[PDB]
Amino acid sequence: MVPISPIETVPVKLKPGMDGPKVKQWPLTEEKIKALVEICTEMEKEGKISKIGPENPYNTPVFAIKKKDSTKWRKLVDFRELNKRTQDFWEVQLGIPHPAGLKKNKSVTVLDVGDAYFSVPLDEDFRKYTAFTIPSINNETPGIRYQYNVLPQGWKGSPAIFQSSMTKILEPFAAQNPDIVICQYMDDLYVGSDLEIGQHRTKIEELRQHLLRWGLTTPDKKHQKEPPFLWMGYELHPDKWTVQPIVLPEKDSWTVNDIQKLVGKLNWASQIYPGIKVRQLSKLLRGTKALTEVIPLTEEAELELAENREILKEPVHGVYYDPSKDLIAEIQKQGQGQWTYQIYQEPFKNLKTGKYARMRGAHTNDVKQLTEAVQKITTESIVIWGKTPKFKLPIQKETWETWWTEYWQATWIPEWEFVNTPPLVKLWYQLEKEPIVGAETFYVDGAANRETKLGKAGYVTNKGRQKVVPLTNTTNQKTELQAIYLALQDSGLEVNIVTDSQYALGIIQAQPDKSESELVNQIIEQLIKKEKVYLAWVPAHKGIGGNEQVDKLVSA
């Protein structure tokens, strides 16, 4: 005997106060029963299971499935119930690595571990919960009883406990071999390094050695695998990576489910295929929750899709991380609150790419969106490379300065430089800080009757200019805005406006440059045309003449 270290067992408890499973064994055809008895006999021989008494009162049903085009049956135990009653675990799979964060590996070897898996024992006191019964021929006998000794396939803790047990074994090898990288995927270990391929198979032989210490063999009659490697939807090669081939279907009939699977692929692909747009395709998804609903494509959706197919007409690759060189991120405005980015280290060799969608709001502006994008990219880059990329951004240094220096919120982007590739992001208008001298002063106001929906909006000025317009199907908030719009419309290039609307102020102090309220847009459009605009607020109903004058005028 070559003595072998035990895989240390992991103590597993049932959920608090809950008890195990007691589920009716399903009646089985004689054919399936014979099938199961064979399967379990061999498994018992392998130490995977053990016969139990009639004491153990737990049951999980078991089943038989004939593999398609194989006369063979396969055994399937339905742990769904026991999973519902087994505790929570610290699952590790939560984060999958992202190809762009890897380093190039000259040699990458693939080892099989479908046999190491069963070298992982199940906690002694928990085995009883895994009980099951193969029924007997004609129920003329007590159904044979079996319980598990290894992590059962399809149990809650199997993956978490399997993963962790392996890591625990691999840790000293990995740590004394810092020029090696190991990864766990299905029943398989993948090990790469960056050495000449003689020095590399050495270290594999060293690993096969190390694994043997726990009585583990990893078949040297290895796999037909060659580049690329299909893995978590990608295509990994020794020196590059891309998404697993993206093909956009042709259709003369697009449905809610059809377009859904079309954005998923576009979103998924947008991580390496540059300039990929969604929006007008996820627009057609708005609200409608019938998965079969044949939605019509706008003439924006067809042109966006035809912009996609053109980008997906040929493959592009991302590189791998070269820790020695800088990380750059570059963003572009795409309109309709769409941003698109590339992260790269040397010109044109992207590591990955992406898109950012504006946040669902009612008012917004380009500078805000760019910021949000920058932050999304920042967190993404911390996750993948452990650092913040340097930004190249289509916004003048001067514009950003004016923005953050005058914005009411705190704001920041990390190290960055201006990149002159239109459309540049700009501030469209800037409100005065003090009243303007020689500029006409417009006192505005608006009011509506909450029931009739009628109200009026208008202004009066120091120069005797007046207006009151009447309005149907409006609200107080709409009339206060409309009033401001009149004042902008009827004034010269410089103007002072006084309002009592907290609501209105709040919208314009957010400095939006696009809105969903066409009324706000009109105001923005007016603001853009002006040379100087001072907006001043005063409290309502305090008889501030000027204000009072037009309040009495619009509450008529």
Give residues with Cβ within 8 angstroms of 293, minimum separation 6. 255, 256
Say whether residue 167 binds another protein (CB under 8 A).
yes
Determine the size of the site formed for another protein (CB under 8 A).
77
x-or-dash string of contact with ligand 1BT, 299-338, rule CB under 6 A: ---------------------x------------------
Known binding residues for Mg(2+) are 112, 187-188, 445, 480, 500, 551
Touching another protein, residues 411-470 (CB under 8 A): 411-412, 434-437, 440-441, 443, 460-462
183 sits near ligand 1BT (criterion: CB under 6 A) = yes
Shortest CB 276 distance to ligand 1BT, Å: 24
Does 190 bind ligand 1BT (CB under 6 A)? Our answer is yes
Torsion over CA: 334, 335, 336, 339 (sign): positive
Q: Is 90 in the site for another protein (CB under 8 A)?
A: yes
DSSP β-bridge partners for residue 459: 444, 467
**Quick one: which segment of 102-110, 140-148, 329-337, 400-408 binds ligand 1BT (CB under 6 A)?**
102-110
- Order of strands across the sheet that contains 416-418: 349-357, 338-346, 328-335, 390-393, 416-418
372 is a site residue for another protein (CB under 8 A): yes
Counted residue by residue, the chain has a size of 556
DSSP 137: G
Q: Which of 52, 77, 108, 122 binds ligand 1BT (CB under 6 A)?
A: 108
Instruction: Between 65 and 96, name the residue whose CB sits nearer to another protein.
Output: 96
Site string for ligand 1BT, 216-255 (x = CB under 6 A): -------------x-x----xxx-----------------
Which stretch, 242-250, 283-291, 332-340, 409-417, contacts another protein (CB under 8 A)? 409-417
Instruction: Map tokens 């571990």 to a residue.
Output: 113
Give 58 or 320: the residue with its C-beta nearer to ligand 1BT: 320
Q: What is the distance between the alpha carbons of residues 543 and 403, in angstroms, rounded to a whole number?
A: 36
Q: Please report where in the chains the tokens 């960056």 appear, as a residue.
A: 194
Q: Among 34, 48, 104, 208, which residue sits at the site for ligand 1BT (rule: CB under 6 A)? A: 104
Greatest CA separation found in the chain?
108
Binding site residue list: 112, 187-188, 445, 480, 500, 551
State how far the Cα of 390 lies from the Cα of 327, in Å rounded to an integer. Answer: 6
Residue 29 or 199: the one with the smaller Cβ distance to ligand 1BT is 199
Query: What Å distances lie between residue 430 and 399, 436, 534, CA to CA?
Result: 11, 13, 9
Q: Is 32 left (phi over 0), alpha (psi -120 to 50) or beta?
A: alpha
Long-range pairs of 301-304 with CB within 8 A, sequence gap ≥ 24: 304/277, 304/279, 304/280
Interface contacts to ligand 1BT, rule CB under 6 A:
97, 102-105, 108, 181, 183, 185, 190, 192, 229, 231, 236-238, 320
